[PDB]
Design an enzyme around this catalytic site. Structure first.
Site, PDB file in Angstrom:
ATOM      1  N   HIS A  41      65.709 -10.096  -6.485  1.00 63.85           N
ATOM      2  CA  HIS A  41      66.003  -8.925  -6.419  1.00 63.85           C
ATOM      3  C   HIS A  41      64.959  -8.048  -6.527  1.00 63.85           C
ATOM      4  O   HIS A  41      65.430  -6.563  -5.646  1.00 63.85           O
ATOM      5  CB  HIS A  41      67.018  -8.191  -6.971  1.00 63.85           C
ATOM      6  N   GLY A 143      66.309  -1.094 -14.989  1.00 61.51           N
ATOM      7  CA  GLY A 143      64.763  -1.044 -15.038  1.00 61.51           C
ATOM      8  C   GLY A 143      64.509  -2.368 -15.350  1.00 61.51           C
ATOM      9  O   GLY A 143      63.454  -2.578 -15.924  1.00 61.51           O
ATOM     10  N   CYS A 145      65.732  -5.567 -15.806  1.00 55.03           N
ATOM     11  CA  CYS A 145      65.816  -6.850 -15.260  1.00 55.03           C
ATOM     12  C   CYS A 145      63.635  -7.142 -15.201  1.00 55.03           C
ATOM     13  O   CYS A 145      63.165  -6.237 -14.691  1.00 55.03           O
ATOM     14  CB  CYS A 145      66.283  -6.609 -13.920  1.00 55.03           C
TER      15      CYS A 145
END
Ligand code: A1ITW
Ligand code: A1ITW
Lengths: 305, 305
Positions: A41, A143, A145
């Site tokens: 993503h 942030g 991820c």
């Protein structure tokens, strides 16, 4: 003496973290040898997250649309591919700080350390468990991820988790390092509810053995029980059922303490039926389920890495 | 979202740990530039610990009696000296992995990460607080002496603690990196009892603000109080008295949440007078005192290192 929620030393993983940017979205990647692994993503806008077609979105992306920075130094991207929910970016340089490592898919109840990262940089380390409903109870902000979960044995880092998302209930979901989610979650902003969060019974027992080893013994009682009888009680309190494999795994703690597993189970049962009466165990007023039997022996025997 | 006891990433300190051996005793040292810092009781036998004269014992020791190993590689000892309770071993090689660093002496209530080590090797990392009675509630086994506690700001490791001993009550005592004990303890096997372990009130408040930020709000009430009135209550429950300096330090959390400090204090007061009624706050059934206001903002804002 003492007993703490203890994480692995994070240095071997610190060396692997990088920043990956695609268009205007930035998250963390894991650089091992000449591959950077990150959540797919990375290629979406926040609008795209409502209903992404990742294959379609990825056609619009070339090697040069993926910026990868390690410290303040830019890596050259020479290849990209999608595996399940992760992207694999081939870069032209092997990570010199690459540790010995493995990718593992863990079972519910197993514990691991999390190195929370933002912008490719470490901010903190903590331990958590894969819950029976395949969530983790993390601490993670926008942030984060690409942050990873790992175990370390002597020289070897076993990566088990990569963080992808937060549910509206504030618990966390993610993948193994092949890109496959734990549990039923998808990488889309859709209604996703987690199922029943049961208590990891074999972990609670291990923690009671830890308490005994450390001198907290008030909850030992005069009773024993049977696996069938204890399990009637565990079901009622939303505990996972105890099997003989669990009993086998607790045998070292049972031997160290001289308390038969089934006697410890009878102790557990009374604590469930009666509560703690305002007392504590190893500094907790709740029964703790995020230490495995291996965790307890490791901590109570001083294994290094 | 979520809230965890989170330690600093340990990699900068991992690079500094070594093994120091003197005669048959082994513990951990901290190698910074061309100095290895370790507990002076490295020079004692376990019999010597009953009543050591460290000055006398150290006369019998030369440079070559101090073996220092970093990984599997031996350092050459070119100078030794005693400062308070620590030994400073001058070696011929600067540590290449030396980070930017400082030695700080912390105040009671301040938190720090511990990198537990055995034989010069990292085994785990955890957070703890300097208690008001100048103990820490660590997790430490025989051979863990020389392990250090630290904070990290961006590039800079601030060393605040070096572990020296366990009390018969199973809590821990140690020094700053100049060798001076926290609290009244001495490095001798003598009767040493710790004083009253009070609760760090400003930390508990900070943690209640953390709970509010994370969505746990059930304990907010309709009341306010005064500093004098709250303090009558804190005294009764063995809480440290709250001062206006504390109120000032909580002002960012108060602003973020819109809950005046004194209103949060009134919330605290009711939780003290009434207990938790079997409920939890941020997954705890007790009031947690080992997060500073700075810790809460750091964790809830994603600061990296
Ligand atoms: O723990 C996390 C990770 C998450 C994150 O960094 N996101 C940006 C990247 C795309 C993410 C996303 C995933 C699935 C669906 C829709 C969006 C949201 C987040 C946002 C807020 C608070 C906590 C957290
Ligand atoms: O946390 C610690 C550190 C301690 C240690 O490693 N010691 C060896 C070195 C000399 C130490 C000592 C200090 C003061 C007085 C008498 C002896 C004991 C220990 C021993 C058992 C359990 C836990 C722990």
């Amino acid at each position: 003496s003492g007993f703490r929620k203890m994480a692995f030393p994070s240095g071997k993983v610190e060396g692997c973290m990088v920043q990956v940017t695609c268009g205007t979205t930035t998250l963390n990647g894991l650089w091992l040898d000449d591959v950077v692994y990150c959540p797919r993503h990375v290629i979406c806008t926040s609008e795209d997250m409502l209903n992404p077609n990742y294959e379609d979105l990825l056609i619009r992306k070339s090697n040069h649309n993926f910026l990868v920075q390690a410290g303040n130094v830019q890596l050259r991207v020479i290849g990209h591919s999608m595996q399940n929910c992760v992207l694999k970016l081939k870069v032209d340089t092997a990570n010199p700080k690459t540790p010995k490592y493995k990718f593992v898919r863990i079972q519910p109840g197993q514990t691991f350390s999390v190195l929370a990262c933002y912008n490719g940089s470490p901010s903190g380390v903590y331990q958590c468990a894969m819950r029976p409903n395949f969530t983790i109870k993390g601490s993670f902000l926008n942030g984060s991820c690409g942050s990873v979960g790992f175990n370390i044995d002597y020289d070897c880092v076993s990566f088990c988790y990569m963080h992808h998302m937060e549910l509206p209930t504030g618990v966390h979901a993610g993948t193994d390092l092949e890109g496959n989610f734990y549990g039923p979650f998808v990488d889309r902003q859709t209604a996703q509810a987690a199922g029943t969060d049961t208590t990891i019974t074999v972990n609670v027992l291990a923690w009671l053995y830890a308490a005994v080893i450390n001198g907290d013994r008030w909850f030992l009682n005069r009773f024993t029980t049977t696996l069938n009888d204890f399990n009637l009680v565990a079901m009622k309190y939303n505990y996972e059922p105890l099997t003989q494999d669990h009993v086998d795994i607790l045998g070292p703690l049972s031997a160290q303490t001289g308390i038969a597993v089934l006697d410890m189970c009878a102790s557990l049962k009374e604590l469930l039926q009666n509560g703690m009466n305002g007392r504590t165990i190893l500094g907790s007023a709740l029964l703790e389920d995020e230490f495995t039997p291996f965790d307890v022996v490791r901590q109570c025997s001083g294994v290094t890495f």
